[PDB]
């Protein structure tokens, strides 16, 4: 059973161990009570420049809301971020994949709208 110290990775070089596990009432939630399965730190993105992670998260939100499988083939001019954002704005979501989350401990809104969505993770 996964636990603190088990190594997980996305498909973009974003590896890390489980720091802690919070129950569903302790995790942050959207207005429709969706809690993240995983929370990763924003500081893993900028130096690494794994923008594929973010585009995959956004495409995955579109895919899950649309009932399809996203096409992430490398060199495809028929798929860019603006198209994916326009598609996501049609399902009642912020076009860039952000959502207002609430603090699970206090229930107050988090001032900064969080970037959340489906991403394929791997257990190593």
């Amino acid at each position: 059973i996964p636990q603190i110290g088990d190594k997980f990775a996305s498909r973009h070089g974003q590896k890390g161990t489980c720091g802690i596990q919070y129950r569903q009432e302790d995790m942050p939630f959207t207005c429709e009570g969706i809690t993240p399965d995983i929370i990763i730190n924003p500081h893993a993105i900028p130096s690494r420049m794994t923008i594929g992670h973010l585009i995959e998260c956004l495409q995955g939100k579109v895919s899950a809301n649309k009932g399809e499988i996203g096409d992430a083939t490398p060199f495809n001019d028929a798929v860019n971020v603006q198209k994916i954002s326009n598609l996501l704005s049609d399902y009642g979501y912020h076009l860039r994949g952000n959502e207002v989350l609430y603090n699970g401990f206090t229930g107050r809104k988090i001032t900064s709208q969080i970037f959340i969505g489906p991403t394929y993770y791997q257990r190593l």
Partner: protein, 260 residues
């Protein structure tokens, strides 16, 4: 220095969810109610399995874990049953547990779907939700000709703090201040964000004018039930459980104050 006088307004009540609004309460009370929906509303769930025979392609712990997550109707029985911690019996008794039996064998050529309908209980009140008298039955395992699964489960009383299988909710939507009047969020581009279903704003207006003297009131809830409890039973049991947590805390507080 005294309590709130909250009011309630239920805007939708089905067998699947309850959508309501609590007004004139603190955000901490609203979020503790929301948390108790998930983590301190007891229900009945399988928490003990004895596999007598399993020739299926899923190992024993797979089947056991899978049985634990089947919701069992807990409406009137959960209040009566005791925690096995509190029961003065041996490992089990009908006062703290419910016995289930499952015995399936695939003799025919087509795949046999061992579903929650095959979980036979000794208690008629505590049965799998899908088996209750549409939605199909939860699939425990598929069996091939010659494969067989025979087990004996016991279901216990617990809540979501111990394991998510004792969580009665299939999602708790919680919201407040749909128009960002308290500015607890700060949209870099307020025009880009969709409107809440509870918003009262004309489409040209993106968010409400900032309310400096405002406090979070009017919390909107949509408590979806996994099936074990009715959604309104989830809310009532949540309020009762939170009140008994506070009552026990006050009892222990009084003992500590008087002992000093």
């Amino acid at each position: 220095p005294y309590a709130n006088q909250p009011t309630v307004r239920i805007t939708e009540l089905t067998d699947e969810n309850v959508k309501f609004i609590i007004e004139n309460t603190d955000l901490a009370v609203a979020n503790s109610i929301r948390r108790v929906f998930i983590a301190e509303v007891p229900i009945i769930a399988i928490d003990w399995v004895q596999i007598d025979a399993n020739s299926s392609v899923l190992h024993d712990e797979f089947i056991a874990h899978r049985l634990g997550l089947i919701p069992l109707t807990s409406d009137d029985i959960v209040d009566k049953l005791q925690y096995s911690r509190d029961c003065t019996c041996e490992e089990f008794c009908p006062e703290c547990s419910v016995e289930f039996t499952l015995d399936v064998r695939c003799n025919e050529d087509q795949t046999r779907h061992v579903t929650s309908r095959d979980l036979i209980s000794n208690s008629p009140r505590v049965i799998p939700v899908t088996s209750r008298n549409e939605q199909d039955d939860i699939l425990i395992v598929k069996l091939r000709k010659g494969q067989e699964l025979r087990l004996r489960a016991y279901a216990k009383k617990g809540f979501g703090k111990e394991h998510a299988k004792w969580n009665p909710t299939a999602g708790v939507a919680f919201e407040y201040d749909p128009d960002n009047a308290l500015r607890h969020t700060v949209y870099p581009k307020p025009e880009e964000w969709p409107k809440s279903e509870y918003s009262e704003l004309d489409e040209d207006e993106s968010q409400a004018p900032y309310d400096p003297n405002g406090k979070p009131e009017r919390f909107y809830y949509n408590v979806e039930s996994c099936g074990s409890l009715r959604p309104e039973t989830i809310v009532l049991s949540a309020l009762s459980g939170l009140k008994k947590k506070l009552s026990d805390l006050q009892t222990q507080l009084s003992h500590e104050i008087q002992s000093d």
